[PDB]
Amino acid sequence: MDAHAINERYVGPRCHRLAHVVLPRTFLLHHAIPLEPEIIFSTYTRFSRSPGSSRRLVVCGKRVLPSPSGLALSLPLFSHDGNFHPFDISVLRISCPGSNLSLTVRFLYLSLVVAMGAPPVRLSFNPVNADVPATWRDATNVYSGAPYYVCVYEREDDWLPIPLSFPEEPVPPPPSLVF
Amino acid sequence: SQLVRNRERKTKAHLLSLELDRLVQVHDSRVRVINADIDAVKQMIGNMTWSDNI
Amino acid sequence: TDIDTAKITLISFIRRIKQKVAALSASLAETVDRIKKWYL
Amino acid sequence: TDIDTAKITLISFIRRIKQKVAALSASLAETVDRIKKWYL
Amino acid sequence: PCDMLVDLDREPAGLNVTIYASLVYLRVNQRPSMALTFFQSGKGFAEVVAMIKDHFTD
Amino acid sequence: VYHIYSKISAGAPGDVNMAELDLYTTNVSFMGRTYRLDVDLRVLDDLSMYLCILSALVPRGCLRLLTALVRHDRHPLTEVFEGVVPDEVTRIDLDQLSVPDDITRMRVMFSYLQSLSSIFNLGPRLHVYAYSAETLAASCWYSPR
């Protein structure tokens, strides 16, 4: 649960929003994610109806020991031109530095954006803290069908919902634009 | 084909509940505006006997 | 009578309309959540 | 000033609320009709 | 006194093991109050500064 | 300090107060005594171009060195000095410079870190152990570095 608040300081300014995500063991057992501390995560999003590539950002992940239990992460969400797309895959790539391991875990924004919906001079000292309380909201992955949790931390904010820009006609069917 | 018959079967059900949760979260974000607008008039009504006094 | 009649009119007519806007938010939170368990 | 101030208050505050009730009827007529062509 | 001196230590030895004096500022009972310890190692100045910071992490 | 603020008031005179400048710089207080120095500085035009060319590489250089060194095996005192860094320094986008540009803003930066640190830790000093204030004769022993 420290792995959320570390990423708000260092992954935070390089993004638009962070999707704070906690993956239970039921999600871990399907994708076979062996929780060693050597694993270096990396995230990038694959756009739709636009030139699809964003920059790769290294995201910290720490195992939570026990009210859920599992791997804690933080997924970057990218708002190109002021709004989110509904059909936009946020890809997580899991790999070890020394040994041979490469996993791809993919998340869609509608399973993330919906889940977000409810004299000597003094120097400023801002440590990393877990003081902020979590709100645990359910989610299900579209691609495997394994449940994962989404943290919504307390901080033109309460007035608006989180923006989306749905696709327009003509369009392929959304089971064929997801895959 | 029969794997596409199950992708198009399940992702028409997973994506359907995401749009219905989005639809409620549009609606509750606007009823909050109406309760912020009804209570703004009623607050001005509580001083309407004072605003007419000038 | 401008104080007394406008207090009983411009509040109680507003409170009966404000409680009916919340019925729209509570009906969808009952029925759209009913659609998923019954039909989806 | 009871005629002039209550005319600009108790109409224009009501017209801005009345136009927002119709936004709820137009949003469902746009989105529930969107669900059928996209997903059903 | 053996109370002040904190001894640090296959390691080579020269014709030398130095003795360092560290004077550490802190604050006890929300009032300023320093502290002084003595060290003893023949590890070279790049290592001892890394070894003193381990002693004063708390 | 005097050589830096006398270059801002040459470019823009409305930013430096001359009366505030020579009240805090020309007085030196040491050993309970005040020494009024004599200033009319082409000697210090090597430091002020090295200390200010280091002044902009440090806010990028301490964020770029923290985003790479994040792991389970982090040294525990760096969690404490993770808060002394200001708010505005932790909003730098490191993507706006290219990867061949971020190499030459470290190798340039690390040379102005060491070569500026070395000239103040130079040791041609000598330890006086006797001094007579009216004869001015002092005994000592030399000690290099």
Using a CB cutoff of 8 Å and minimum separation of 24, what contacts does A166-173 make?
Answer: A166/A86, A166/D34, A167/A48, A167/A49, A167/A85, A167/A86, A167/A87, A171/D38, A173/B8, A173/D38
Structure tokens given for F49: 């171009």
CA distance, residue E35 to nearest chain F CA (Å): 19
d(CA B6, CA A175): 10
Nearest Cβ partner for B26 among A110, A145, A161: A161
Q: Compute the count of residue pairs across chains E and F with CB atoms less than 8 Å apart.
A: 3
DSSP summary character for residue A127: -
Asked if residue F63 lies in contact with residue F90, where contact means CB atoms within 8 angstroms, the answer is: yes
Residue F46: how many other CB atoms lie within 10 Å: 10
Structure tokens given for E3: 């109370």
d(CA F86, CA F58): 12
Of A114, A141, A150, nearest to A20 (Cα)?
Answer: A150
d(CA C17, CA D13): 14
Of F83, D26, D6, nearest to A125 (Cα)?
Answer: F83
d(CA F66, CA A171): 44
How was this structure obtained?
cryo-EM
d(CA A46, CA A140): 20
Length of chain A measured in residues = 179
> What are the start-end ranges of the H helices in chain A?
2-10, 25-31, 174-178
Nearest Cβ partner for A114 among B8, B11, B18: B18
B near E: at least 3 beta-carbon pairs less than 8 Å apart: no
**Cβ-based contacts of B44 with chain D (< 8 Å):** 9, 13
d(CA A136, CA A142): 19
Residue A42 backbone phi and psi in degrees, to 5 = -155, 140
Instruction: Burial-class residue F102 by CB neighbours within 10 Å (0-12, 13-18, 19+).
Output: middle
**Cβ-based contacts of A110 with chain B (< 8 Å):** 15, 18-19, 22
| 3-state secondary structure at position A83 | coil
Angle at A19 between CA A17 and CA A24, to 5 degrees: 170
Asked if residue F143 lies in contact with residue F127, where contact means CB atoms within 8 angstroms, the answer is: yes
CB-CB under 8 Å, C18 with B48:
no
Chain B: residues touching D (Cβ < 8 Å): 12, 15-16, 19-20, 23, 26-27, 30, 33-34, 37-38, 40-41, 44, 48, 51-52, 54
DSSP summary character for residue F79: G
Of A105, A30, A35, nearest to A63 (Cα)?
Answer: A35
- CA A133 to chain CA mean position, Å: 18
CB-CB under 8 Å, C24 with B20:
no
Asked if residue A143 lies in contact with residue A103, where contact means CB atoms within 8 angstroms, the answer is: no
Beta-bridged to residue F35, according to DSSP, are F28
Of C2, A160, D6, B46, nearest to B38 (Cα)?
Answer: B46
CA distance, residue B54 to nearest chain D CA (Å): 9
Say whether the peptide bond before residue F86 is cis (omega within 30 degrees of 0). Answer: no
DSSP summary character for residue A133: P
> What are the start-end ranges of the H helices in chain F?
2-11, 18-24, 48-51, 57-68, 99-103, 107-118
Angle at D10 between CA D6 and CA D15, to 5 degrees: 145
Give the end-to-end CA distance of chain C in Å, rounded to a whole number.
58
- CA E29 to chain CA mean position, Å: 24
Neighbouring residues of A106: CB distance < 8 A, sequence distance ≥ 6? A89, A90, A91, A92, A143
Structure tokens given for A116: 């977000």
Residue A28 backbone phi and psi in degrees, to 5 = -75, -35
d(CA B46, CA F25): 63
d(CA A3, CA F116): 37
| 3-state secondary structure at position D36 | helix
Q: Which residue of A has its CA nearest to B26?
A: A161
A near C: at least 3 beta-carbon pairs less than 8 Å apart: no
d(CA A8, CA A13): 8
Q: Where are the beta strands (DSSP E) in chain A?
A: 17-24, 40-46, 62-63, 70-77, 89-95, 102-108, 136-140, 147-151
Neighbouring residues of A79: CB distance < 8 A, sequence distance ≥ 6? A16, A17, A163
**Cβ-based contacts of A173 with chain D (< 8 Å):** 38
**Cβ-based contacts of F77 with chain E (< 8 Å):** 53, 57
Between strands E5-7 and E35-41, the pairing is: parallel
Asked if residue A74 lies in contact with residue A19, where contact means CB atoms within 8 angstroms, the answer is: yes
Instruction: Dump the DSSP string for F107-139.
Output: HHHHHHHHHHHHTTS--EEEEEEEE-TTT--EE
Tokens 């969400």 belong to residue? A77
Cα distances from F58 to residues F3, F65, F94, F109, in angstroms, run 21, 10, 13, 8
CB-CB under 8 Å, F72 with A14:
no
CB-CB under 8 Å, D27 with B27:
yes
Q: Which residue of B has its CA nearest to C1?
A: B49
| 3-state secondary structure at position A18 | strand
Using a CB cutoff of 8 Å and minimum separation of 24, what contacts does C32-35 make?
Answer: C32/B20, C32/B23, C32/B24, C35/B20
* Domain span holding position A83: 1-118
d(CA A52, CA A88): 9
d(CA A89, CA F119): 55
Q: Does A172 touch chain D (CB under 8 A)?
A: no
Tokens 């899991």 belong to residue? A94
Instruction: Dump the DSSP string for E8-56.
Output: -------S--EEEEEEE--EETTEE--EEEEEEE-S-HHHHHHHHHHHT
Angle at A107 between CA A102 and CA A113, to 5 degrees: 150
